[PDB]
Automatic annotation (TrEMBL):
It catalyses: 6-phospho-D-glucono-1,5-lactone + H2O = 6-phospho-D-gluconate + H(+). It comes from the Eukaryota. Keywords: Hydrolase. Hydrolysis of 6-phosphogluconolactone to 6-phosphogluconate. InterPro entries: 6-phosphogluconolactonase_DevB (IPR005900), 6PGL (IPR039104), Glc/Gal-6P_isomerase (IPR006148), NagB/RpiA_transferase-like (IPR037171). It comes from Leishmania braziliensis. PANTHER family: 6-PHOSPHOGLUCONOLACTONASE. GO terms for molecular function: 6-phosphogluconolactonase activity. One of its GO terms (biological process) is carbohydrate metabolic process. Belongs to the glucosamine/galactosamine-6-phosphate isomerase family. 6-phosphogluconolactonase subfamily. Its EC number is 3.1.1.31. The lineage of its organism: Eukaryota, Discoba, Euglenozoa, Kinetoplastea, Metakinetoplastina. This is 6-phosphogluconolactonase. Pathway: Carbohydrate degradation; pentose phosphate pathway; D-ribulose 5-phosphate from D-glucose 6-phosphate (oxidative stage): step 2/3.
Length: 264
């Protein structure tokens, strides 16, 4: 495991660095008629990246250079301001062709997604429909030793929570140990919000992606960063240590608090 680590001074620099990785992948395509598959992250950290892509690179996107998917999602309505779809749409996807964006159908979960216990069955219903869509619309490859396939994502954007989670792969959730599905499910950990059921790309999908790019800022993420980077497992051990087993490249874009102690 040999990740690129870039400690940025601020979120402007972080967002510019993430943008460069995306544009490099788009320009590096041999076949310019097939899109780069990009899995979007949520929360608030990548919002500025999306805004920058909207201002600078909209032409490439209107030419179908990128196929967009949500790497995880809160099971709220698409017009709910705390959905990742809402955030991504306001920042960027409002002017991206619908044909280049894979939607999640949340309807099956909306009646129960805020019920910590009762929401599980509805979350799985949404996960399963989204998995079918991904397997039908993305480039896939067979998973060795199985009768199953995995979508091959070119770039997975990720963040870190202060709880050590990434995507919606939370500590002590189904997703944390789900090695069987393309899309899994979780409820947030005690410190994390919004308190609503989630769907997430699984560890497997992330570990088969060509490039993984994490954007994380704050001293409260430092233990997560150091727990991912330690050669030997170290406690407290973040669930996001699974990133060490990525087959693709991994880049950590960090601010000074998140990156404290890492670099020379």
């Amino acid at each position: 495991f040999a990740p690129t680590v870039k400690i940025c001074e601020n979120l402007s620099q972080m967002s510019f660095a993430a943008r460069e990785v995306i544009l490099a992948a788009i320009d590096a395509r041999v076949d310019k008629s097939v899109p780069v598959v990009l899995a979007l992250s949520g929360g608030s950290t990548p919002k500025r990246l999306y805004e920058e892509l909207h201002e600078k690179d909209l032409a490439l996107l209107q030419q179908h250079a990128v196929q967009f998917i949500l790497g995880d999602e809160r099971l709220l309505s698409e017009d709910d301001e705390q959905s990742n779809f809402s955030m991504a749409t306001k920042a960027l996807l409002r002017d991206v062709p619908s044909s280049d964006v894979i939607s999640i159908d949340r309807r099956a979960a909306l009646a129960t997604s805020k019920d910590e216990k009762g929401g599980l069955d509805g979350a799985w219903a949404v996960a399963q429909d989204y998995e079918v869509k991904l397997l039908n619309c993305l480039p896939c490859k067979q998973i060795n030793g199985t009768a199953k396939s995995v979508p091959v994502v070119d770039i997975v954007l990720l963040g870190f929570g202060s709880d050590g989670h990434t995507a919606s792969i939370f500590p002590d959730s189904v997703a944390a140990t789900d090695e069987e599905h393309v899309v899994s499910v979780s409820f947030p950990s005690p410190t994390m919000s919004p308190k609503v059921w989630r769907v997430t790309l699984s560890k497997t999908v992330i570990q088969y992606a060509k490039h993984v790019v994490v954007l994380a800022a704050g001293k409260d993420k430092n233990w997560v960063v150091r727990g991912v980077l330690s050669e030997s497992p170290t406690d407290p051990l973040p669930v996001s240590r699974f990133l060490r087993d990525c087959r693709g490249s991994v880049t950590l874009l960090l601010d000074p608090g998140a990156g404290e102690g890492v670099c020379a």
